[PDB]
Paper text:
The most well-studied baculovirus is [name] multiple nucleopolyhedrovirus ([name]). Baculoviruses have their large circular [name] genome packaged into an enveloped rod-shaped nucleocapsid. The BV nucleocapsid structure consists of three parts, a central helical sheath containing the viral genome, an apical cap and a basal structure attached to both extremities of the helical sheath. Herein, we report high-resolution cryo-electron microscopy (cryo-EM) structures of the BV nucleocapsid combined with de novo modeling and Alphafold predictions.
The BV apical cap displays a prominent crown-like structure sitting right above the C2 symmetric part of the BV portal, adopting a [name] symmetry and being the vertex of the apical cap. It has a maximum and minimum diameter of 23 and 10 nm respectively. The asymmetric unit of the [name] ring observes a distinctive ‘sickle’ shape, characterized by a straight vertical ‘handle’ domain, connected to a ‘hook’ domain. Thanks to a higher resolution for this ring structure (3.5 Å), the extensive modeling analysis indicated three different proteins, each one in two copies, contributing to form this crown-like [name] ring. The handle region comprises a dimeric Ac66, spanning N-terminal amino acids 4-75, with the remaining amino acids of Ac66 conspicuously absent in the [name] ring structure. The ‘hook’ portion of the asymmetric unit consists of two sets, each constituted of two proteins: Ac101 and Ac102. The first set, encompassing N-terminal amino acids 29-119 of Ac102 and 2-78 of Ac101, is positioned closer and perpendicular to the handle part of the assembly whereas the second set, including amino acids 54-117 of Ac102 and 2-63 of Ac101, is located at the tip of the hook. Within an asymmetric unit, Ac101 pairs up with Ac102 in a heterodimeric arrangement. The interaction between these two proteins is pervasive, extending intimately across the entire modeled length of both proteins, with a spectacular β-strands pairing forming an intermolecular β-sheet. Ac102 of the first set engages in intermolecular interactions with Ac66 through various polar interactions including a potential salt bridge between the Lys32 of Ac66 with Asp41 of Ac102.
Numbering used by the authors:
A (entry chain A), B (entry chain B), C (entry chain B), D (entry chain A), E (entry chain B), F (entry chain A): 4 to 76
G (entry chain C), H (entry chain C), I (entry chain C), J (entry chain C): 29 to 119
K (entry chain E), L (entry chain E): 54 to 117
M (entry chain D), N (entry chain D), O (entry chain D), Q (entry chain D): 3 to 78
P (entry chain F), R (entry chain F), S (entry chain F): 2 to 64
Write the structure that this text describes.
Amino acid sequence: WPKYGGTDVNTRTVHDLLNTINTMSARIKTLERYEHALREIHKVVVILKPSANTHSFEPDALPALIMQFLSDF
Amino acid sequence: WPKYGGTDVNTRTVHDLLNTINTMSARIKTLERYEHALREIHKVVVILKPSANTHSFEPDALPALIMQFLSDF
Amino acid sequence: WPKYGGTDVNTRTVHDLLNTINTMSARIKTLERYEHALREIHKVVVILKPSANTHSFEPDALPALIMQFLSDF
Amino acid sequence: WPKYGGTDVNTRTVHDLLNTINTMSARIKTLERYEHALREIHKVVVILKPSANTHSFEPDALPALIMQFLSDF
Amino acid sequence: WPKYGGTDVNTRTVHDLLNTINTMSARIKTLERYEHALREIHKVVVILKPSANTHSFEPDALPALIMQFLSDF
Amino acid sequence: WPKYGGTDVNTRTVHDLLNTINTMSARIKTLERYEHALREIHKVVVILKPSANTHSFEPDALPALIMQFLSDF
Amino acid sequence: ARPSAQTQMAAVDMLQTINTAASQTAASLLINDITPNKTESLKILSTQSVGARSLLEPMQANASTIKLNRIETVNVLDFLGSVYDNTIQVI
Amino acid sequence: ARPSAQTQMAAVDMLQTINTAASQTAASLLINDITPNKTESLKILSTQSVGARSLLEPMQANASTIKLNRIETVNVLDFLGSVYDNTIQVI
Amino acid sequence: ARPSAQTQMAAVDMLQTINTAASQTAASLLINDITPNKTESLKILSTQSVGARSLLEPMQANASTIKLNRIETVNVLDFLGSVYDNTIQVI
Amino acid sequence: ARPSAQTQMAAVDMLQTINTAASQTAASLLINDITPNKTESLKILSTQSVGARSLLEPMQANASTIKLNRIETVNVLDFLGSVYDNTIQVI
Amino acid sequence: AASLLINDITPNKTESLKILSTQSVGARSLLEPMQANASTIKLNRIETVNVLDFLGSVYDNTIQ
Amino acid sequence: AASLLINDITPNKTESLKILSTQSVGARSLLEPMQANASTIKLNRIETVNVLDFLGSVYDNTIQ
Amino acid sequence: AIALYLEINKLRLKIDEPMQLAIWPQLFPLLCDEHQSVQLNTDVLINFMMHVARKSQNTILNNNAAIASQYAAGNA
Amino acid sequence: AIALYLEINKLRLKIDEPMQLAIWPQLFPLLCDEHQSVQLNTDVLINFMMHVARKSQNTILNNNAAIASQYAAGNA
Amino acid sequence: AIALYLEINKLRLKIDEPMQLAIWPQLFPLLCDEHQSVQLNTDVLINFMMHVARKSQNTILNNNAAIASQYAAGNA
Amino acid sequence: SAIALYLEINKLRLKIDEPMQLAIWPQLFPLLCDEHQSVQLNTDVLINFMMHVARKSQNTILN
Amino acid sequence: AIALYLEINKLRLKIDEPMQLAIWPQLFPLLCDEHQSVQLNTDVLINFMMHVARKSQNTILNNNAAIASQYAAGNA
Amino acid sequence: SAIALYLEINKLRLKIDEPMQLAIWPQLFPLLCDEHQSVQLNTDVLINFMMHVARKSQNTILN
Amino acid sequence: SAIALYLEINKLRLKIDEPMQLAIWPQLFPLLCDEHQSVQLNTDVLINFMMHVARKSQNTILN
């Protein structure tokens, strides 16, 4: 067969790589959906208390920001 | 050349597929944090106010759940 | 030439079909955001005022659901 | 067979491309329907509070605009 | 060379896999303390305030359980 | 066969090493998830009593810190 | 055993999409060339056919008549044959 | 027995991903080279093809015309052939 | 009979781990050597290859050009061949 | 029919234990010898190998260079071979 | 038959007979120096490339 | 036949006949000293490497 | 002249089987060596181009319609 | 000159089967020894490069689309 | 000189099949005894090293991806 | 093109002389080194090389 | 001298198949009777020892990992 | 390259003389020691070594 | 039309001389270069080329 690096190039190789790409693309779409949801949640938090929440969007702090908003009230 | 369903496959095809896999893997690794934060926020809503859509994970409903949840307090 | 059901097929036929696929793919990628936003709005209506058509997604009913929902408050 | 690029031109190739185009065209119609629904929702929001909602249509902000309208009242 | 599903395997492949195993083993040994502490915190919540999600271990819910649990007292 | 150290290099050896790596990678992901949960719990504890809990994050003391917070009140 | 209505309308959707794609053929390019002389379409097509160039030069000059010889006429006729066969690929 | 809608849309997602990957080909590199002369793309490609170098030198000079001989023309034609075949691997 | 989604994502986790392991190859060592001349990577690799030493000495000197003879050039080429084959084991 | 997760993690526990045991090899003893010259490890190993003694004597002297003859070099090479084969049993 | 078989059986010291018969289908300036009974041949890069290609092709197959 | 069989049967004391016949396909400066009937041969590192490679190859197979 | 005649025949088969367009007898003079060139009215050539173009586009769209109908039929 | 002719033929098969691009007769002079060099307009060479590049990228993307469609088909 | 030629061929097969890198004709002089040494620009040698290194690392990572995909496939 | 000459040398090498032990390869090497020159070789050497290719081809023919 | 050569070969097979460590040509002089002794830099010998030691320990740990993996496999 | 000479000595060793009992190995060793020199050996010794390789190869041929 | 002459040369090439080693191809090339000219060739060369086509066709006929 033709070869790329250490991998034989044939129908089965392409099929396997395509299966991996299929599942991984679905996963990427789901995760992008999650990012969009977090952005929407952030905007909700912003409109609730815009006097402090208009600093910058940060996924890893938004849960803590929501918990803080609860802590204040 | 080998063929996939009647489309020619060469070494560049496999090379491109493998580069795609690696790039997508890096993207997925980056994106996992978004799932973790989204699920944390979901559980905040579920625990503090058990009701309705708190009984099923739904990324498209959670921003409105935040709206309701945080506006009530 | 090869035929499809009795209509001649040439290389330009396949070329045009593939260009169609790629253009449509770009259009679909652009349009997905509209589905995401529409479903977010649907869930806003469902969560804040559970009733009737809130129990089934229906893009042609949701604008009237917004009319009702937002006019009530 | 005749060939376009790396793809053989024959009945089966055209049939497969046509199946893909069929599904993708249906998807495009559904997504265009969603865009139309968002436009109608935007017009509803506009007639409810035209003093501020007559700026410009933007699918990615309309959910947040509805949530804001709720926030005001 | 030997092959794995059509990808060449050499001594460096096995060497890299074994180095991966050892490095991951060290990482796992380090990380076990985190599981132990998390489960201790979970049991604190379960014992002092039996309710709801205290009846099922869930690392993504436990931070919100702490929020509720510690804010109540 | 080719050999690395004392291990024969062949399909089965790679397959076994890959199985071990698979399980161990899953374990590492679960433990990293636990670490993230402990970090979130720590931030909750911090926002509850920031006058003393803003020293430094330490997984092995966080359970005791929570128990102390209970002891104070 | 006629196809269902949904099958036929799915074919119709396919047809509308494919015709929207077909809007980019050389024949179309010539058709929608609003310039009094087909200057823009022939400028685009001059990268694909010699006859397009031969027609192009005088039509830019806004000549009331165009003199063609045997070779130029053959090239122009082949250009129109290609326009019919849809062998020109407008990029 | 046509594939389900979900199968086709999964293929579509694969296609979008793979085309995003394809955005890095040499042909693409040439296409998105906004410089009036393809100086940046040819600098990148000069590490992969002799014809890229031969084109590169005069185009940096901003020459209105470029003199090529038999050998340089052969190299340039091979460069374009490689661009078509996608045998150049831009790193 | 395609593998399940969980199987594919488990393979993805394996891939990420194994690539993190692969970050320690000689090729990587050369790539992430931020020094203007590859002095640090060649110091590390001089314990594994003669060509690394031959390149190393002048590059530390910050020479604008490096004179190589037949033997040194052969050693350098073998060094690069080893970098490609990943036969150098960086400790 | 892959082994269960519990089986693999039991193997991992075994591996960690066995590697903790392996920490006492002669190669390890050499590795963790923080002395600028490997004086302590070579004192320990001089009870197991002649080459260890031959290296030991001058390194205690803090000699900048060590003169070895054919016999001493053979003994040192055999010492390193034993370190690799893990035939030295450190007690 | 074979081109190189003809080369072998050619009795001429220079073998200009076979060189002529094969140059009618292969690009070999060789013919002129060898027919001229020259002691040496001036070979440049381009002609050398043709020599190498010719020798390979006759090694495989250039039967006329 | 075999290259080393030819070496054995060669009756010449220096065996320069076989050395010549095999040097046309193997890099051996040996030919010159041995044809010259020299008593000794000056061998440097590089030529020694060729000698060793030649001897190995003829041990296995260099039949012409 | 043979090449011109045959190319006219080809475009004839594609565009106008009965050769009723005015362009044909206006191009015929080029078959005679003496008539090295022919002065044609720009408008006539443009109209001939548009005839070819519109007929071609209609044929393309109709072929697409036939393909769609056969796809609906299934047995294709 | 033979090498130039054959390489032109190769790039022809890849890019322009009917050889309608203006570059071809401008490169033809190099087939004559006397014409050691040809002065070409930089813009023409750039446009030829862009033609090759755009055609190539379209072919690559279309091959990817064909592969995706066949993957959806399954029997590939 | 034979050893240098063959080693160039080996690294060629590994890195650059068409030998388009500038380093190759700059190293060619060493095949002539008279050219005992060649002065090369440090930047050129560094760039050649980086080409080799980046290509190698990409190949390694892609082989790892292929192994992962085949593991997901199972039948390997 | 020096690159072309090198690649053609390798192509012929693969079929005539894998290890490149013939003197003609060193004799031809200078063409890869400097531009605008040529290598003067003996007609004896070149015709002997041609018969060498002939003998290799004859061995292939027999096989 | 034969014993030294063969012992070098043994340690070569174990530690450095291509013999790229600097120690090898520094030890080579001992193969000549005239060179009864060689002055080596203490740092070089220590570094060679550390190379051997680290490679050995890595091999030992990797063999342990292989044994653990095979134990998990069961069929060993 | 002294390393290359050593490795070639080992390669030939594996097939001609496993234990390296021939005097020619000590005679050749100096080339591995100092640079820019050569070893002058008797034509008797070298041709005897060549016939020794010939005899080893003949024994292999018989087997 | 120079393009037509080139394409016809390629068409005949595919059947008479794949590698284009006949001198007649260089002899004909000038027609592709400059306009309003001709190439004067020997009747010996042209008739020899015609018999060459004849021999190629005869080989095809036999096959």
